[PDB]
Design a protein around this nucleic acid. Structure first.
Ligand SMILES: [Mg+2]
Ligand SMILES: [Mg+2]
Ligand SMILES: [Mg+2]
Ligand SMILES: [Mg+2]
Ligand SMILES: [Mg+2]
Ligand SMILES: [Mg+2]
Lengths: 165, 156, 267
RNA sequence: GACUCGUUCAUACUACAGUGGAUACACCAGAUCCCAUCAGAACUCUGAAGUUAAGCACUGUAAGGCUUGGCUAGUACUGAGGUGGGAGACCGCUCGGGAACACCAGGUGAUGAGUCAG
RNA sequence: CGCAGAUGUCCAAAGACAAGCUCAAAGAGAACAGAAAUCUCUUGUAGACUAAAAGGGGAAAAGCUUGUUUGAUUUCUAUUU
RNA sequence: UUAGAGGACAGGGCCUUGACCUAUUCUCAAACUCCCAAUAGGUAAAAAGGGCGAAAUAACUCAAUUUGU
């Protein structure tokens, strides 16, 4: 009635594995896609096989909501022509998928910028989620109010008319 | 070599009890103190400022000084053929109002009215406490059906 | 996967204080606010409590005794209807007026109102009280500082700074604070939402139009309410419960419920 | 029927369930302004279309935990005496003090100050 | 000349104050990505961290991140080990 | 630190031995602790003092020439 499922947010993530020019180009790609400034993530460790160090920037990501999120999700799902695996849904109620080329989202290619991939992840939830995030009297959500794995698949099929493999 | 520090030998003395960690309550800060009062020194390890020394944990004294957050206490201590008065300065969390005095105060208050009444009727009153003494004789009724006989037990 | 909430988990657990557990009381701010000098005794150090709920604001005077603190004055935001202010009872101005009421009511209870006149229309030693802000975070423009200004406009002395008033991050401008006291910002929002998207104006301020309050007379009703509050601050001179609360059982009753459940399962 | 500030700091916690909305407590509708971020999610400000689904309140689980009695048990241990026993290791007597785990049964709160509606 | 160990150092911040925040780890899920890169979500009484031995203390903090600073300043008493 | 039992990633092609989880089971600690004695310790048990009223002195304290001390 007012326990229907909406989209809480959407996070786009590009892990380049190195710092320097390529990371900045990926950040520019994300900015043109979202009209927002992204931020960077840093390695907590140092791994010799990967060649990365602590406190070193490795990736860039951004989070979106509102009307803007539902259309970026629309584009991404369209590149998948509305088909997802059943393994893509977690047992808490979220899902996600990936893409190989950022051109197919309608962004004009530039010879200098190059090609990049990214990830999509949604975090479905109902309303009343405020009580677990506010400062004053934060509490816990009851178990019935959560979104189970099957509710997530029904929501996907009913909204986007997609099919599960 | 020998190790005689300030907090040596206080592993179990200065530790919190089971499921009773954390800093003190807020009412602890509303306690009333006056000059000459009796007080107990009990170290609270979760406040590291102004802790007492090892020896004095659990002793009782009198107040000789009150400050912004501190109290001076007079405490006896045995040194090898005599007793010395020590002046201990501690902070207010390690201080508790002593309960060693309350029976005397209640006794005085209660005996006041008994004296006033006895003199009002011109009676003879005795107010000193009585030590437990020998018991008087009595006649105890018991049905014969209620006495159970016992005897030593065999070994098993 | 090894379960983490074992029996040994529940045996070793220590629980916080109830009001910390409920997200209401700080308990580091509180004790620093109640404690006084141990040799300055027979002084109580009152505090001025401001709480803002949803659709209302509250003010109080506390005393912090040993078996539970005592309240000496109290005023709620919904009282302002009697003083001529219809709906709008969460404003900056509403909080200021509520803070004024508590001070004026507290002075009259002691019979000191004629000696401490405070300040007139907005532009012995006084009794002192320290501000208790609760859980919220204190940014510039927070409504708790309007209630403080209203209480100081009465006879009370509440110590404070100047950098937390609206528009005063690094320069104190009294004009901005005065405009927010009189509700100019709300009137300007009403003005600007009318030029564009007029239907949103009709929906958003639905009870302002319904109660015949326009954008042009917002300041005057607050200026009149201040005077009426100063004139007379004295507080104005069994329910049915159609639903009923279920009660608890006992040991003997619980056994028969097990008898019945097992018997029903048998066949 | 509800709220604000407290005191005990689990009989007050935890996991699942059932029931409730005159006023109130909430979720909730927005971003011009004070303010805030990658992000009006949070924080801050301005409101009153919708809902008890959730927070919250009361109750229910041969529920876990916690708490109070009974038992374990005069058992384990121990102060004073002995030209007591025994190769010893160890163990009784006289005058006295006295546990713990486990197991069984009941319980799941109480309260200070001040207000609102009716 | 019993047992297991440590000291002759180190820090303009690792000193002072305030605010916001919550940590180890496990599970499920996301292009290259794998046992371990970076992202969300559930659980989480400290299983992390707190210069250096060991012990005590610590969760809207004493831990992490920010902002402003030089109370690591001059003089004197009552006293503890 | 010994041993089986019941459940749902390694293995020789539907079964080893395992791994993981759940309830048990034999035995232990000067430098382990949910609990916790006997013995050994400390303070108190009224007259230079206590109780209950009024008045006076302060440059201290308080919103207070009355608030307190
Ligand atoms: Mg604070
Ligand atoms: Mg319901
Ligand atoms: Mg039970
Ligand atoms: Mg600890
Ligand atoms: Mg802090
Ligand atoms: Mg044994």
């Amino acid at each position: 009635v007012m326990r229907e499922i909406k989209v809480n947010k959407l996070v786009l993530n590009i892990c380049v594995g190195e710092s320097g020019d390529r990371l900045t180009r990926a950040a520019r790609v994300l900015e043109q896609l979202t009209e927002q400034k992204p931020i960077f993530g840093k390695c907590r460790f140092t791994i010799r096989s990967f060649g990365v160090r602590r406190n070193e920037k490795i990736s860039c990501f951004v989070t979106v909501r509102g009307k803007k999120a539902l259309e970026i999700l629309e584009k991404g799902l369209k590149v998948k022509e509305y088909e997802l695996r059943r393994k893509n849904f977690s047992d808490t109620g979220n899902f996600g998928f990936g893409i190989q080329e950022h051109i197919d989202l309608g962004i004009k290619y530039d010879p200098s910028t190059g090609i990049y991939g990214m990830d999509f992840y949604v975090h479905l939830s109902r309303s009343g989620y405020r009580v677990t995030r506010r400062t004053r009297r934060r509490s816990k959500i009851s178990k019935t109010h959560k979104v189970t794995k099957e509710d997530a698949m029904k929501w996907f099929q009913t909204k986007f008319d997609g099919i599960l493999l | 070599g020998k190790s005689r520090g300030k907090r040596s030998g206080t592993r179990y003395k200065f530790s919190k009890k089971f499921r009773k960690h954390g800093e003190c309550t807020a009412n602890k800060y509303l306690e009333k103190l006056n000059y000459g009062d009796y007080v107990d020194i009990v170290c609270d390890s979760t406040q590291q400022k102004g802790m007492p020394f090892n020896y004095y944990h659990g002793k009782t004294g009198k107040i000789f000084h009150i400050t912004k957050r501190g109290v001076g206490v007079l405490v006896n201590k045995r040194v090898k053929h005599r007793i010395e008065q020590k002046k201990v300065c501690v902070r207010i969390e390690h201080v508790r109002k002593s309960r060693c005095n309350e029976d005397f105060l209640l006794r005085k208050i209660k005996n006041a009215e008994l004296i006033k009444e006895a003199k009002l009727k011109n009676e003879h009153i005795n107010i000193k406490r009585k030590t437990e003494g020998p018991k008087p004789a009595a006649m105890i009724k018991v049905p014969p059906s209620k006495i159970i006989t016992i005897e030593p037990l065999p070994f098993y | 996967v090894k379960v983490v909430k074992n029996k040994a988990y529940f045996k070793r657990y220590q629980v916080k204080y109830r009001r910390r557990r409920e997200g209401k009381t700080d308990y580091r701010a509180r004790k620093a606010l109640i404690l006084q000098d141990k040799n300055k005794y027979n002084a109580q150090k009152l505090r001025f409590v401001v709480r803002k709920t949803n659709s209302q604001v509250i003010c109080q005077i506390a005393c912090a005794h040993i078996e539970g603190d005592k309240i000496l004055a109290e005023a709620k935001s919904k009282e302002l209807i009697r003083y001529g202010i219809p709906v709008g009872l969460k404003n900056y101005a509403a909080a200021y007026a509520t803070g004024l009421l508590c001070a004026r009511r507290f002075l009259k209870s002691l019979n000191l109102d004629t000696q401490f006149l405070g300040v007139e229309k907005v532009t012995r030693k006084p009794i002192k009280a320290f501000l208790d802000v609760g859980i919220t975070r204190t940014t510039t423009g927070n409504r708790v500082f309007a209630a403080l200004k209203g209480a100081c406009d009465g006879g009370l002395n509440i110590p404070h700074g100047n950098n937390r008033f609206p528009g005063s991050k690094n320069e104190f401008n009294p004009e901005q604070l005065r405009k927010n006291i009189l509700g100019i910002h709300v009137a300007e929002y009403m003005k600007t939402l009318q030029e564009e998207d007029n239907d949103k104006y009709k929906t958003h301020f639905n009870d302002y139009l319904k109660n015949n309050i326009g954008a042009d007379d917002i300041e005057q009703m607050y200026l009149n309410a201040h005077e009426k509050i100063r004139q007379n601050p004295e507080k104005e001179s069994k329910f049915v419960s159609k639903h009923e609360k279920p009660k608890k059982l006992n040991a003997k009753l619980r056994k028969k419920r097990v008898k019945e459940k097992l018997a029903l399962y048998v066949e």
